[PDB]
Symmetry: C3
Subunit: 250 residues, 3 copies
């Protein structure tokens, strides 16, 4: 079946992802990447306090990153290497804004410990005349590894669970990332231990496998949007906001 | 389903509209605009004489207009403001041709009064690299309104029944226009009343909502075809042709 | 149905033709051309000796020709006029290679007489911005006709069984050519008769019906691939290879 019928509305389907007071669309189905099974709820294990999450409020879609994709970028050059708990907060905090100001962060302010699966969209608007390729990959503990520069390479992450994005026919990388840390919970700020590496479950990272191969005088620049949903969460550990921690640098 | 298979014949469907000794096609389904219900037959009311229409002859598709669409045309600039009974005749008469010469007009020559629904095609051949938009709109009595210049605007006709045409993915505006005048019949020429505004049931009018937005050195010009079918008619009122009226100017 | 969904893999089906240790694909269904019924097996008629063919070995897909398609080529200019038994061997022999070296020829070396249907692919990689047209046509005995230059024309072969190839939406010409000679068998080399015209069942020939109509500075050159399958064969007539014949010139 192939009859093209673009009316006053150029025809084509648009799948949407609402899902909680925010609707974000994608005109092209994503290339998913599921690195692990869905995480069970270990609140009834580690902590016996206010055991809950926040539905309509922390299970939304906030923006955490956005960047540029150009012909200048050589073969393996990561556009982002963003930590995943974590840079949800660390993006907003360095936006000359506070964590307290946004609805998808506020319990991190009050509550001490967090556990939950993650959802991520790597949406880009590239043109059909751009011949490039990216790869969004996940690593459940990047900073803990010593020589991960060895792994920090397009070759290395192809070896593992990832998603693929090609400039033409742009395209989205779905990226379901459930919770798998060593300890079942994460600490939102400084704690009797975890005096650093606060709220870090691993980093995402997008490098390049094919530069934007542009014709003579073709459009140079491109762009990426990183979105994140925090579903299936649990926030036990009620603590005043003066105990909080404005996350570390990029 | 999306497998593209363009053989020696580039594949794609072509819907056709024959319908009476003329076949006109459209490779893209139209955006219809039905302003009113189908009109009932009031011949057995106003006049008791030869009560009939003409099938294969006046229910065809003649051309009445054609024009240019260019980047120069600013935002709201009507390409045509053509009266609808009316300019079926008024186009041919000013073509240095006579009404008598064409089969889709001849009963208007002889017969005194006419009633009937109308069918109209606003077909254009624009290219997929042209980013513009038109709007064909109908008004069951334009000349009767005094300040209709107020209405003569892209904003105003969007308020009402219309069709939309965008340059890219060109595209057709189906435009079924049934009979709705004040008096159930129309006079083909001067009459004991209707000494002017002869044969006028309202005017069609195509303005611009988006100019042809062309890249550097992209194709400048475009073009429109206006076709018209006169179905569901009735022509009671037999009169010699020396009583006829060559319609007024553009 | 027309929803376009080109993921990291630009979506679209790819039909394949394996068929015997070689897989060749075509992303666009072919325009077939069947000039005759399937040939019956006349081995149990002409010759009472080792009656067999060779499956996995001579029923493969070898390349016999490839050439250039450019704007310079005027209206009717044959890109190839290749004989069909025949140039399967005659291409390889003039490749500074021997017949003995390739698996799809070796029985022709040993065996004296051959009969069999033929399969041919005229695959080309033209771009969607090239507006040309070719025509691959078959003639069960071209050399036998005296004034076939009269027939050697785009007009003439359109009169008969052929396939059509247009530059844009490139495209393949399937070309099933069963055996129909005067005598039911063909001689692989010189023989008590057939002292010339060795192994010739007719010639294929691709001319032009529409040159590559290229925009300013659009891509000039193009290209064709000719493939051939020799199925439904029969090779009776065992003879030493010193009796063989390296085919005549192009």
């Amino acid at each position: 079946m192939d009859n093209p019928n673009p009316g006053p509305d150029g025809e084509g389907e648009v799948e949407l992802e609402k899902d909680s007071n925010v609707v974000l669309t994608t005109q092209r189905d994503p290339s998913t990447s599921i690195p692990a099974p869905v995480s069970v709820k270990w609140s009834r294990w580690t902590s016996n306090d206010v055991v809950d999450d926040y539905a309509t409020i922390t299970s939304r879609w906030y923006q955490i990153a956005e960047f540029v994709w150009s012909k200048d970028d050589p073969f393996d050059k990561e556009l982002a290497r963003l930590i995943l708990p974590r840079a949800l907060l660390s993006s907003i905090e360095a936006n000359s804004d506070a964590i307290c100001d946004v609805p998808n962060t506020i319990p991190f302010k009050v509550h001490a410990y967090w556990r939950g699966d993650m959802e991520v969209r790597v949406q880009i608007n590239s043109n059909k005349f751009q011949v490039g390729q990216l790869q969004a990959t996940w690593y459940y503990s990047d900073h803990e590894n010593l020589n991960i520069s060895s792994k920090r390479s397009v070759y290395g992450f192809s070896q593992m669970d990832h998603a693929l994005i090609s400039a033409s026919a742009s395209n989205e990388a779905k990226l379901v990332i459930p919770f798998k840390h060593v300890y079942p919970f994460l600490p939102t700020r400084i704690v009797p231990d975890w005096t650093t590496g606060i709220l870090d479950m691993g980093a995402l990272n997008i490098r390049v496998i094919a530069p934007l191969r542009m014709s003579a005088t073709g459009p140079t620049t491109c762009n990426v949007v990183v979105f994140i949903k925090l579903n299936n969460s649990e926030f036990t550990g009620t603590s005043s906001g003066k105990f909080y921690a404005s996350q570390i640098r990029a």
